[PDB]
Amino acid sequence: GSPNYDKWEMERTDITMKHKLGGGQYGEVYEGVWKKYSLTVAVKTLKEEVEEFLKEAAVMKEIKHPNLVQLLGVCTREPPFYIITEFMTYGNLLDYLRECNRQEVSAVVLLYMATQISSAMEYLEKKNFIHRDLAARNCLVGENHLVKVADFGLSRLMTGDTYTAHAGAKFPIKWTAPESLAYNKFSIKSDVWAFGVLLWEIATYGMSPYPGIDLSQVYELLEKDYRMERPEGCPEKVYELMRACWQWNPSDRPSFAEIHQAFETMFQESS
Numbered sequence: 218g219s220p221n222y223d224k225w226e227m228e229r230t231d232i233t234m235k236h237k238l239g240g241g242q243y244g245e246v247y248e249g250v251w252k253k254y255s256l257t258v259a260v261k262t263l264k265e266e267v268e269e270f271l272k273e274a275a276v277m278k279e280i281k282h283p284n285l286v287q288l289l290g291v292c293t294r295e296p297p298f299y300i301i302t303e304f305m306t307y308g309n310l311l312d313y314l315r316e317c318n319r320q321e322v323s324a325v326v327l328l329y330m331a332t333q334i335s336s337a338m339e340y341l342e343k344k345n346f347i348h349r350d351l352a353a354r355n356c357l358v359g360e361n362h363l364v365k366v367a368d369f370g371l372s373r374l375m376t377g378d379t380y381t382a383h384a385g386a387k388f389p390i391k392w393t394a395p396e397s398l399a400y401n402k403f404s405i406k407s408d409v410w411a412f413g414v415l416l417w418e419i420a421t422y423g424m425s426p427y428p429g430i431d432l433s434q435v436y437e438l439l440e441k442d443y444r445m446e447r448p449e450g451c452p453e454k455v456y457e458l459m460r461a462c463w464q465w466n467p468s469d470r471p472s473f474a475e476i477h478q479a480f481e482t483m484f485q486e487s488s
């Protein structure tokens with residue numbers, strides 16, 4: 218209602234900062250509390266660069282989905298900058314899977330998780346956005362196994378079909394598509410490749426990918442058509458989808474729209 222009104226800007230003193238969450242595992246991301254609504258929130262901040270932060274904030278102002286961690290506000294009028302998002306009480310999926318009782322987090326739950334994530338990614342796909350760091354460590358868990366994709370530091374709205382990373386830029390090798398590793402070319406399809414790896418993390422309940430292989434041999438192995446083996450207890454149809462996500466030719470990988478209806482159907486069939 219006033220000249221400098223901005224629907225996302227919050228007054229920093231409105232937020233109580235507590236401690237760095239995820240054991241510093243995510244950088245300057247802290248648990249905090251939004252006093253006025255007595256709400257626990259996650260708050261990412263900056264030290265004393267900024268283009269990246271502003272871009273991340275900008276991206277979050279544009280995406281909204283049940284399975285994408287929701288932006289609640291920002292503090293970007295002056296240092297220190299804040300990106301304020303809802304808090305997911307159970308932390309990240311990688312840790313959640315590694316420490317769970319497997320009769321509780323059963324076969325049907327694994328399908329539920331994949332379905333939620335693929336739903337978030339179908340939404341990004343349709344909006345022509347790419348995530349660029351899909352992995353179990355970047356998904357979050359809420360009540361009743363609610364799962365949400367998080368960490369949009371590398372996300373961006375694409376103008377065309379690919380985005381070329383600057384170079385000298387290093388990536389999380391084990392989750393990176395061949396074309397991305399070799400030519401820094403990212404796209405929705407490179408996110409689909411990462412989703413396939415994420416599915417393997419879900420099927421193994423949090424195991425590190427490419428067991429025993431040196432990060433250095435990864436690309437050569439993929440080039441020979443080596444792919445991770447079917448995890449013990451992973452249904453054949455799920456592994457099939459895994460292999461499809463890892464098709465060498467990006468155009469040969471399924472779309473997230475396809476992946477999602479495939480998972481939603483398997484999820485329902487296991488009621």
Ligand SMILES: COc1ccccc1-c1c[nH]c2ncc(-c3cncc(C(=O)N(C)C)c3)cc12
Pocket residue numbers: 237238239240243246248259261286302303304305306307308309354355356357367368369
């Ligand atoms: C990927 O998450 C992020 C990456 C970058 C910026 C923000 C987040 C983020 C937003 N909401 C969150 N909620 C919980 C945790 C969270 C994850 N893992 C462990 C904890 C934890 O320590 N607790 C207290 C459960 C919390 C992390 C986030």
